[PDB]
Amino acid sequence: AQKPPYSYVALIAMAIRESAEKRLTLSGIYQYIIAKFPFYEKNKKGWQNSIRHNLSLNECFIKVPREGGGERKGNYWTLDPACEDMFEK
Amino acid sequence: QKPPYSYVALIAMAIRESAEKRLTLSGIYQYIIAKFPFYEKNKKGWQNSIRHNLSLNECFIKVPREGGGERKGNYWTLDPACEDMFEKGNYRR
DNA sequence: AAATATTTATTATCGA
DNA sequence: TCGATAATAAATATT
């Protein structure tokens, strides 16, 4: 019972390293973040767009190809082989 | 050829240098160019500086635009006390 | 008209 | 009072 004002930044690449295959999608993001804590909600476009723009400022992300496991838009999103050893932690 | 001039005063001067005084945001730059052309649109560096003046003041108001004026930007105007203050001492050193 | 990602754009924090 | 990192709204491009 307290205020979580800190978890808007590192919730993006988290689902990469918390997982085992390191390429979970927005579906896995949603279901796992929901399964984690009992207050946050996906029924708000505000917080959704907030977490959406949290990915553009820092210049370390990149787009990586994927086949028809859900690809109609195009490639998935992950990190760069350079800013690697700073996101496992 | 950028100006060493007060940027809030730059916005207010652009304001008084018009009749409608409520032009769109995407034209604001052009007007400053009309005075002192230096900057290039590709340079994304010094934008936050002008932003600091645009957002942080106490003589402007924020009012939502009309749905037909659907572009990127809003309209701003001055304050009567700010008007009568700037009308006297606007261009000193 | 509802919800993915390259640019734009208020509140406020730091630093000079 | 002029500049550099973060944290937040509302309107284009993309599927």
Residue A10 CA to residue A4 CA, distance in Å, equals 13
Residue closest to B63 by CA, chosen among B46, B77, B50? B77
Residue B90: strand, helix, or coil: coil
Say yes or no: Cβ of B1 under 7 A from any atom of strand C: no
Helices marked H in A1-89: 14-17, 26-36, 45-53
Say yes or no: Cβ of A89 under 7 A from any atom of strand C: no
- Tell me the structure's resolution in angstroms, rounded to a single decimal: 3.2
Q: Determine contact, residues B34/B20, Cβ cutoff 8 Å.
A: no
Say yes or no: Cβ of B88 under 7 A from any atom of strand C: no
Using only C-alpha atoms, what is the Rg of chain B?
Answer: 14
Question: Chain C: nucleotides under 7 Å from a protein CB?
Answer: 3-13
Label the pairing between strands A76-79 and A61-64: antiparallel
Beta strands in chain A (DSSP E): 61-64, 76-79
User: B73: how many CB neighbours lie within 10 A of its CB?
Assistant: 13
Q: Which of residues 50-79 of B touch strand C (CB under 7 A)?
A: 51-52, 54-56, 62, 72-74
Q: Which tokens belong to A45?
A: 């476009």
Contacts (Cβ under 8 Å, ≥6 apart) of B60: B76, B77, B78, B79
Measured CA B32 to C1' D2 distance, in angstroms:
18
In the DSSP assignment, the letter for residue A83 is S
Q: State which protein residues have CB closer than 7 Å to strand D.
A: A 5, 8-9, 46, 49-50, 53-54, 57-58, 72-74; B 6-8, 45-46, 48-49, 52-53, 64-65, 67, 70-72
Q: Determine contact, residues B57/B80, Cβ cutoff 8 Å.
A: no
Residue B36 CA to residue B14 CA, distance in Å, equals 12
Q: What angle do CA B52, B58, B64 make, to 5 degrees?
A: 80
Q: How far, CA to CA in Å, does A55 sit from each of A4, B20, B59?
A: 20, 39, 34
- Indicate the helix (H) or strand (E) that contains A40: none
Cα dihedral sign, A55-A56-A60-A64: positive
Beta pairing partners, A77: A63
Beta pairing partners, A79: A61
